[PDB]
DNA sequence: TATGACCTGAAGTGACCT
DNA sequence: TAAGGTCACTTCAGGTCA
């Protein structure tokens, strides 16, 4: 086949006749004088399956050198002395989280002499904390409807999702809430514990548990509103929950909040590149309790001793 | 069984 | 004569709209409009955008696109706009510096060349920047103690109990011998496990109720980790000590209920779309045995600040390896998560088990009683 | 926590 | 306030001289 | 011939401003 001759071997387009050894045309020429020039390593994304023709060649310059190379050009032909020489946002934005969680929360301290509420008695502290979690169930779906997406969702999705978190949900949040107070927390009805009361109660175990690995890492680190409300979104979507119609959907939120929270983290701390690892390694801890105070509400609901109301019983039963 | 269901409802 | 141009054109318009685009922008072709508003939607996220009360079912052309800004936004992914496209603010001041002050405008001054009259390069420390020494001497070791305690499983294949095969299906022997034979594999498990740990760098730096409570508590996770990493995708079964294969039915036949069984078997095939290789599992094993909310530790803080070196080298391997896929990272941290909720039903079987008055090896009755 | 610590100690 | 035609402006390509 | 260079030409980022 001497025809060939008049074509190129890379492109396969109309060639001068030879240049760095085969024949091929300016443009495969000049592309192999500029790239070894300078030698760019390139990275094609793709990965190595393109096939290089005439009218496409621009498109993949890696591929195209390394078939230029496969066709015997040589590197040493080439004059002129050289040879080898941010976030993901507006689908699941951090602002209308953090809106959510300033609308739940309204208790905040700035720069003397004055707080809110923290009064006190040792009884009863698992009665008073049942009575603070049904209470703030209700703020936990007004939270769940300002979260981005979640509303969307099909209703009895939003049912499962909220009854499979509420726990964890609920427990970030006082854990938060108490980030000001050691030890130990306080109550959304006001009331406070202090784990005496807690270990009194026989429920100290679990307690000091919330107080050492929540409360306790979340002061040191000194997690704001923005990070506490992607955790407790990542906590609110689970594809694992039992009875999803699409748990691909939550998942997908899911990373939308990882990228999301990532990005938070890569802005507001630039300081700590193990900020978002740190706060993502909150995660399993708090999983370990929100099923362990799960046992005891499981517990203390078939002693028929504490008072439990109707929408803890709803969410227990 | 009933509370959530009306409350995600409005 | 002929154009000195590449030019590939004419007008294949727009995977967003349908308007006409003027080229590829994000890795995708596209208007000023859709190049413009995708730009300003990533740049500023915070913007206030209104939900979209006309249902997912918006159309999108030259004109409704201004209506529903989100359903613009989605079609603009479903185009395949990628967010790494868009240039970082630390990113861009690198492409206006050079391009400003000195380079390509208004100044060109050196020693050759001058018409003067009247108007190292390479390498500071030897750098190449990230995955430093001393992180990838901790993988290679971490792997290579991996496969040094691996290897020591291989030889206690036959000193367990036969597995039976055409054995009468009401037979309760068979089942109590075939959950005899899984609680021997777990036994083998965690020999090698210990041994594992025994290896890990920083772990000989604790105390001996520490590092047996840090042991007894992630053993289990451990364990659904290594089977997760035996599991084929394909045949659904899980091989273990390489010549051993077992479907879900073999569990099914060993008397372990379903909410045990299935679970752990979504468990293993989540993984599989992860697409981790040794050295993550190996990360991921030491980080998971350093976690310091486990129960009946006395110096957490060491164990905490042991957590600390293995969590960042996991950073490191993974942006570099893939950067194309950023989730990898955090998702592999979420099923620490997965193994908490896989722990606590594992305690559950191990209750159901002592429910039947079932006896288990005194190991395993050491560290799940 | 006799038998895991007996498994410390050296290879088992 | 958001928007899109329109610009700045580099890095690149190739037909055609040299 | 076969090496170079030139500079009309493309591209796709950000920025402007009516
Ligand atoms: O082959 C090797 O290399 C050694 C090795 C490594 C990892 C696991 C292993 O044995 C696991 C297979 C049998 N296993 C039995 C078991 C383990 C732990 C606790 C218990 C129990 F006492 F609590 F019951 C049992 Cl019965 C069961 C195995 C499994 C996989 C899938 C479905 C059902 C059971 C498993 C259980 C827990 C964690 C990981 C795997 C040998
Ligand atoms: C930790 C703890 C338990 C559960 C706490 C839960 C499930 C919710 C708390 C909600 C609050 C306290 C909300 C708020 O302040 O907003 C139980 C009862 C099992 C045991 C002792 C105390
Ligand atoms: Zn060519
Ligand atoms: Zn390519
Ligand atoms: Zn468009
Ligand atoms: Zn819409």
């Known amino acids: ?317 | 069984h009933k509370i959530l269901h009306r409350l995600l409802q409005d | 004569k002929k154009g000195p141009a590449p030019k590939m054109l004419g007008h294949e318009l727009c995977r967003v709209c349908g308007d006409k685009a003027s080229g590829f922008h994000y890795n995708v072709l596209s208007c000023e409009g859709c190049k413009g508003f995708f730009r300003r939607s990533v740049v500023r996220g915070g913007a206030r955008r209104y939900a979209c009360r006309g249902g997912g079912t918006c159309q999108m052309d030259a004109f409704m696109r201004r209506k529903c800004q989100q359903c613009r936004l989605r079609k603009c992914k479903e185009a395949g706009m990628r967010e790494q496209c868009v240039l970082s603010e630390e990113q861009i001041r690198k492409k206006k510096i050079r391009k400003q002050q000195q380079q390509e405008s208004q100044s060109q001054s050196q020693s050759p060349v001058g018409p003067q009259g009247s108007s190292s390069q390479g390498s500071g420390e030897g750098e190449g920047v990230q995955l430093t020494a001393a992180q990838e001497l901790m993988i290679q070791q971490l792997v290579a103690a991996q496969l040094q305690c691996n290897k020591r499983s291989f030889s206690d294949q036959p000193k367990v109990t036969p597995w039976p095969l055409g054995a009468d299906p009401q037979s309760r022997d068979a089942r109590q011998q075939r959950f005899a034979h899984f609680t021997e594999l777990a036994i083998i498990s965690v020999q090698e496990i210990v041994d594992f740990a025994k290896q890990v760098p920083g772990f000989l730096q604790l105390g001996r109720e520490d590092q047996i409570a840090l042991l007894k508590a992630s053993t289990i996770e451990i364990m659904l980790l290594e089977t997760a990493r035996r599991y084929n995708h394909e045949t659904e079964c899980i091989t273990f000590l390489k010549d051993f294969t077992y479907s879900k039915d073999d569990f099914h036949r060993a008397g372990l209920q379903v909410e045990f069984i299935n679970p752990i078997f979504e468990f293993s095939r989540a993984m599989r779309r992860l697409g981790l290789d040794d050295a993550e599992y190996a990360l991921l094993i030491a980080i998971n045995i350093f976690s310091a909310d486990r129960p009946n530790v006395q110096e957490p803080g060491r164990v905490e600040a042991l957590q600390q070196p293995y969590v960042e080298a996991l950073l490191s391997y993974t942006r570099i390896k893939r950067p194309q896929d950023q989730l990898r990272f955090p998702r592999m941290l979420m099923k620490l998560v997965s193994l908490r909720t896989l722990s606590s039903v594992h305690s559950e079987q191990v209750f159901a088990l002592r429910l039947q008055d079932k006896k288990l090896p005194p190991l395993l009755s050491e560290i799940w009683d």
């Not at chain 1, 939003?158 to 006082?174: D, P, T």
């Not at chain 1, 784990?195 to 026989?202: D, E, K, Q, Y």
């Not at chain 1, 999301?260 to 309790?289: M, N, T, V």
């Open chain 1, 1 to 317: 086949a001497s025809f060939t001759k008049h074509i190129c071997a890379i492109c396969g387009d109309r060639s001068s006749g030879k240049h760095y050894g085969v024949y091929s045309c300016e443009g495969c020429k000049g592309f192999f004088k500029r790239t070894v020039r300078k030698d760019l390593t390139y990275t094609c994304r793709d990965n190595k399956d393109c096939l290089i023709d005439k009218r496409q060649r621009n498109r993949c310059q890696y591929c195209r050198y390394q078939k230029c190379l496969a066709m015997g050009m040589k590197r040493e032909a080439v004059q002129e002395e050289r040879q080898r020489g941010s976030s993901a946002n507006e689908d699941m934005p951090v602002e209308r989280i953090l809106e959510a969680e300033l609308a739940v929360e309204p208790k905040t301290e700035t720069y003397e002499a004055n707080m809110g509420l923290n009064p006190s008695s040792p009884n009863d502290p698992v009665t008073n904390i049942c009575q603070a979690a049904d209470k703030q169930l209700f703020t936990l779906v007004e939270w769940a409807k300002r979260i981005p997406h979640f509303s969307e969702l099909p209703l009895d999705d939003q049912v499962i999702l909220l009854r499979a978190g509420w726990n964890e949900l609920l427990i970030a949040s006082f854990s938060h809430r108490s980030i000001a107070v050691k030890d130990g927390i306080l109550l959304a009805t006001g009331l406070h514990v202090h784990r005496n009361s807690a270990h009194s109660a026989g429920v100290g175990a679990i307690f000091d548990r919330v107080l050492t690995e929540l409360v306790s890492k979340m002061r040191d680190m000194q997690m704001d509103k923005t990070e506490l409300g992607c955790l407790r979104a990542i906590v609110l979507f689970n594809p694992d929950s039992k009875g999803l119609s699409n748990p691909a959907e939550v998942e997908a939120l899911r990373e939308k909040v990882y990228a999301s929270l990532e990005a938070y983290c890569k802005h507001k701390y630039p300081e700590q590149p193990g900020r978002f690892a740190k706060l993502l390694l909150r995660l399993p801890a708090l999983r370990s309790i929100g099923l362990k105070c799960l046992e005891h509400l499981f517990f203390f609901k078939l002693i028929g001793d504490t008072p439990i109301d109707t929408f803890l019983m709803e969410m227990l039963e």
